[PDB]
Amino acid sequence: STGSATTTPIDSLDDAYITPVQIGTPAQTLNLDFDTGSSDLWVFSSETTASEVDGQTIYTPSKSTTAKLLSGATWSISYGDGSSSSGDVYTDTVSVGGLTVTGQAVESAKKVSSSFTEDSTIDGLLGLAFSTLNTVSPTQQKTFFDNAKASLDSPVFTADLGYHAPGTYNFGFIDTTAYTGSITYTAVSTKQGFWEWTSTGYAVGSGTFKSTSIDGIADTGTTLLYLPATVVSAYWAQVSGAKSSSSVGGYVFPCSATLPSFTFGVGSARIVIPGDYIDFGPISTGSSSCFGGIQSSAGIGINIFGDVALKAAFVVFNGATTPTLGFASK
Ligand SMILES: CCN(CC)C(C)=N
Numbered sequence: 001s002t003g004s005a006t007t008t009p010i011d012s013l014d015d016a017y018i019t020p021v022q023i024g025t026p027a028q029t030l031n032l033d034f035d036t037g038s039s040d041l042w043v044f045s046s047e048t049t050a051s052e053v054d055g056q057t058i059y060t061p062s063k064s065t066t067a068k069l070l071s072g073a074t075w076s077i078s079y080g081d082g083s084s085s086s087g088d089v090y091t092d093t094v095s096v097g098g099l100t101v102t103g104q105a106v107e108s109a110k111k112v113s114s115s116f117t118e119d120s121t122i123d124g125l126l127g128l129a130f131s132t133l134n135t136v137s138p139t140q141q142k143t144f145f146d147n148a149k150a151s152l153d154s155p156v157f158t159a160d161l162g163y164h165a166p167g168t169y170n171f172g173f174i175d176t177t178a179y180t181g182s183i184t185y186t187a188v189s190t191k192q193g194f195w196e197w198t199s200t201g202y203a204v205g206s207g208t209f210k211s212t213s214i215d216g217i218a219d220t221g222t223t224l225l226y227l228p229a230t231v232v233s234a235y236w237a238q239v240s241g242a243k244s245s246s247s248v249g250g251y252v253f254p255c256s257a258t259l260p261s262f263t264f265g266v267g268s269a270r271i272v273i274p275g276d277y278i279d280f281g282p283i284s285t286g287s288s289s290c291f292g293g294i295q296s297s298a299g300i301g302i303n304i305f306g307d308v309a310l311k312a313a314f315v316v317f318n319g320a321t322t323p324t325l326g327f328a329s330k
Pocket residue numbers: 015016033079081083115116119122221
């Protein structure tokens with residue numbers, strides 16, 4: 001089997017991407033944030049504290065003939081940005097782009113933190129990291145991908161995120177029309193439960209390539225590109241007036257600037273992030289100070305190849321017995 005679903009930016013800045021997902025019988029369609037940095041599929045629901053729902057579409061398990069309470073199971077998750085959610089668990093039929101999994105754990109939120117409430121466009125998350133990170137207790141549950149894998153034509157999914165435009169998540173096949181050149185594959189460590197790999201270096205604009213190992217994670221659920229302070233300083237040094245602002249919480253730059261590109265290495269291959277991808281707009285409405293799309297990972301403990309990096313590539317998440325990651329230009 002295969003599946004193919006369009007993913008759409010939630011706003012004009014590509015702050016996140018939502019993908020429609022069918023849950024239950026008859027189908028209830030929710031728009032979920034596909035997140036290769038976590039491993040829980042959770043949704044706003046009829047059980048979510050009413051004051052914490054503001055415009056989201058909810059899953060109502062009592063209206064699904066295939067929903068079954070997973071007795072005794074609870075979940076609780078907190079993300080790198082300080083947000084969180086928790087609740088109980090149902091199993092139900094879940095379909096993405098024509099690919100159907102029966103008996104999928106659907107984690108129903110009883111509580112969500114303010115940033116989720118405040119984002120009316122995201123009805124929940126669909127985790128695509130390794131199932132070892134799944135938070136369901138006392139019996140850990142599998143991701144949608146892990147459940148689907150044996151049925152797929154090939155045990156892979158691909159992320160093709162758009163810049164200020166829709167893109168595609170495919171399951172079970174590689175669309176050879178969706179990228180240019182060849183796909184370069186690179187080794188993955190699953191030791192931390194992430195799609196963790198090592199970039200071979202970077203360049204800033206038309207500058208020379210610096211060969212240096214940068215261990216990090218491919219994370220569709222993170223907006224920006226978080227890299228070591230040395231690398232980030234070298235980038236912003238090429239932008240007149242750019243500075244790190246503790247009050248704003250990162251590097252900012254004059255909105256009048258033209259940003260240089262940023263290149264990252266994948267083996268001997270190179271992925272080029274155009275300068276415009278690194279512009280996240282005024283820090284507040286009407287400001288002439290703009291927020292940078294490349295930021296320091298120094299306070300995080302891990303480097304993160306988030307959407308800013310991934311949207312510059314066609315990315316293969318290869319879930320074979322020994323997983324690997326593939327990157328192609330597009
Ligand atoms: C987990 C990231 N997130 C969704 C974009 C929020 C609202 N905190």
